[PDB]
């Protein structure tokens, strides 16, 4: 295989109720922690799974509608409607608090020091630095009105902001995205399911390009877009925009993309679909490297898998699974299975791997 697949944990083995293994109650903001909200009566608890020590979870009583651990530190952000609080778990201490004017419908850590807040009407960034309070970044576009918000993310420089929501229409799930430029102060609505930014240095360019990659299924097929956002740096060639098909077999009529992470090390896009297919795409050309069903159950939450520059996720059955490029196998797979020596050589030179030299 060009990928290594690893089951890390079955959350049901830790006595986690499978009813709470879903998007609204389980979060994984980084590969370091999983938080699960469980409620039986009016007695809500949070289960905090240290992924370096999974047999010893912390169970604490809560009254929060949502719990997201900081990506880098055992610092938990808890909310109840408009009330936001941040606790250092090891110091058992409230470190920050803020009340919003509007209900926060979705929130996510976008860095080790900043939480993104989404209301019905606006997106804010809340820095953990000193007396910093939430700063409004943009107004929500009317095209996302009535969506369930499922993701918010940014480019490395926080100059390009992307809000993603979904709704049911005609028994299919339609994705609505809002791309916002900080510098231009302009939004663009996009029909999109899953997306990520990436930094990519093109051959001969002195500077990295900032790429926007999004995958969508429309009424008549799937598409993946890789687009340079913003003006290319002085002296940089522009990234030629890529647009490629996203294959769904005839049997997967209700399938659509639900997760994307991009390998900074390998310049590959990981795309996961609702029915549990993984797709690998080359970031440079958009070429589909690999497709396979890795899960019978929806992988509903993902994060970068830091140690392997891969993707780690949780499915609705409680399987914690990871996919990365298998560095020993990827070049031979592209050569021998895809019959694409061009892609093999290009990817081998990018990551200094062996076996891309055409032997005759």
């Amino acid at each position: 295989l060009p990928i290594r697949f690893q089951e890390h944990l079955q959350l049901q083995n830790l006595g986690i109720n499978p009813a709470n293994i879903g998007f609204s109650t389980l979060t994984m903001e980084s590969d370091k922690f999983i938080c699960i909200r469980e409620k039986v009566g009016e007695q809500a608890q949070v289960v905090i799974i240290d992924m370096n020590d999974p047999s010893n979870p912390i169970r604490r009583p809560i009254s929060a509608d949502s719990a997201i651990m900081n990506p880098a530190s055992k610092v938990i952000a808890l909310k109840a409607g408009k009330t936001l609080q941040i606790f250092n778990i090891e110091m058992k201490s409230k470190m920050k608090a803020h009340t919003m004017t509007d209900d926060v419908t979705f929130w996510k850590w976008i860095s080790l020091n900043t939480v993104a807040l989404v209301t019905d009407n606006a997106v804010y960034h809340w820095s953990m630095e000193g007396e910093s309070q939430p700063v409004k970044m943009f107004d929500r576009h009317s095209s996302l009105a009535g969506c369930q918000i499922i993701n918010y993310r940014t480019d490395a420089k926080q100059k390009w902001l992307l809000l993603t929501g979904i709704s049911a229409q005609q028994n299919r799930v339609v994705g609505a995205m809002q791309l916002y430029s900080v510098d231009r102060k302009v939004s663009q609505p996009i029909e999109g399911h899953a997306a990520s930014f990436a930094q990519f240095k093109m051959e001969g360019n002195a500077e990295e390009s900032t790429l926007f990659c999004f995958a969508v299924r429309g009424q008549a097929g799937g598409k993946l877009h890789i687009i340079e956002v913003g003006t290319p740096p002085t002296g940089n060639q522009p990234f030629p925009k890529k647009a490629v098909d996203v294959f769904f077999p005839p049997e997967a009529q209700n399938d659509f993309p639900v997760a994307m992470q991009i390998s900074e090390k390998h310049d590959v896009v990981f795309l996961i679909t609702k029915y549990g297919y993984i797709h690998l795409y080359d970031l440079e050309t958009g070429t589909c490297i690999y497709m396979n069903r890795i899960s019978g159950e929806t992988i509903f939450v993902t994060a970068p898998h830091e140690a392997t520059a891969g993707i780690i996720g949780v499915n609705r059955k409680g399987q914690v699974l990871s996919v990365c490029v298998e560095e020993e196998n990827i070049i031979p797979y592209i050569t021998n299975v895809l019959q694409n020596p061009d892609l093999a050589l290009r990817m081998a030179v990018r990551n200094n791997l062996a076996g891309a030299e055409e032997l005759f």
């Binding site: 231009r184 302009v186 939004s187 663009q188 996009i190 687009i227 647009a243």
Partner: peptide, 8 residues
């Protein structure tokens, strides 16, 4: 929007 152009 004015931000990006792509195949609908």
């Amino acid at each position: 929007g004015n931000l990006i152009t792509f195949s609908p």
